[PDB]
Amino acid sequence: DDKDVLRDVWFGRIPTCFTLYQDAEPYYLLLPRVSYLTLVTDKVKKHFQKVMSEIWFEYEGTPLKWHYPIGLLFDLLASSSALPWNITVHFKSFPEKDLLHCPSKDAIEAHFMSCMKEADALKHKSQVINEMQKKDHKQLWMGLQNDRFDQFWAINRKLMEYPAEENGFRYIPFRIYQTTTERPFIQKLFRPVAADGQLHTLGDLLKEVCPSAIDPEDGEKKNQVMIHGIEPMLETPLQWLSEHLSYPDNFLHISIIP
Template identity: 30%
Template sequence: MEIAPEPVSVRRMLWNGTIPLKIVLAQQERNTLDLIQPYYINAHRLSYLPFLFERVLAFFKPYLRDPESASSYEWWFEFEDVPLRWNWPIGLLYDLLTGLDPALEDIADHDWHLPWSITIHFNDYPADSLLRLTSVKDVEDQWMNRVKESDFIRRGNSNTVMNLSRADSDNMWAAVVKYDFDMFWNTARKLLPQNAISLNHVPVKIYLPSSNKILQSLITPMISPKEVQTVGTALHTQLGYLFPSRRTYILAKPIVHGISVPMSAPLAELLYECMYTDGYLHICIVMIS
């Protein structure tokens, strides 16, 4: 008798999600008019662009007008003239900026989305649009600030994060850099109450399409002692003009990790399965085509 394989958790499946990237060198950075091949890589959805920098730089360095200055962290990525925020996860950037409706992902008209073509620059840093990046340590600082924020929202204080041992804190960040699922969740599970309904509030950020606007309100896991807060009830309350119904998509869809989320999904439970490494549930709103 064969033993059935252990089912793969939702958390692990999301962790294993990737986005194929096609990275192109900006025209003004090139030292030649000859064709330069793009750099292709499968990027982890939950990871961050700065972790790709050394490999991308090594690939393009022979073709740079000023290869020495390229190591000074003046580099930045853009998609369709929009600078990409280095402190946001790659999957979040893709979902938000492509505005792709997953229901249409197999249609030929949407093939341009994959591989996701982005451009790298090594000069003229858009400091009016992006936070200044001086080293990978800046990525860690930004990430840790959000980990503390999300803990505060969950519990009403950040004591759980602040009381982590130095080894746990270091291991959690090292797991993000190394992209090690087991190493990360060995510590991250200590930050979550055993029961999702016992959360003070659900740390969630809602990103509006074609906009720099982010909604972040204090949303409870329960509407009343007998009614669970769902994705639909939360969006109906926060964005009633896009979600006039609490139960069905009409004008827009909530997307998490490139997946259309059911309106009936309990918000707190969704957080436990689908949170990013910073402890937030990031929801992108995509208009229905």
């Protein structure tokens, strides 16, 4: 059952329509929620370069931060709009102040590994990721790049373990995003267990780090709290969410929508 959740999360898709910025037929693809725009759009680039970081993407006038996972961008920015997601493709006037350059897939690999290392520092003080052989780091990357669930999780499983005498990771890797992508996200140190060893819930996390999301009168959700396009109950244990609903980068990226 829980393994089924890992698979369902891994194979999440956003149907997307790419239209070339005016200054060419629109192009349609199922994009993996868990990956990155600049990693999965070779076909788009191929399609449009036949009529003319450098390519960049835009939603309703706002440049899309490719280093945020696709599913997170969609949930935060477009989940209230009808599918397919309408993205505009640009090849000129790169927004130098707004977007990180992405000159090659190596840049994406570096960002991804950087996120994984920060997550393991939070979870295990880097012990797991540092004890792996270098080729294991490569296998994690190639698992994502080639959309190979088995290949990725043969290694990722190790990052989801924790000591026998514990009931979860040291701290949970999460980031909470509100309204837009340019607003800094919320990220704090938060332990998955309480001082008495009880498991903290999603509600506990929000009460502590984003209480504006909670109705003070009854303690229930006030805003929409979205993870991978679904809305877990507040009483969902945080450790379980970290193990099963994290992105490949080992983070729980969470959208708050008014």
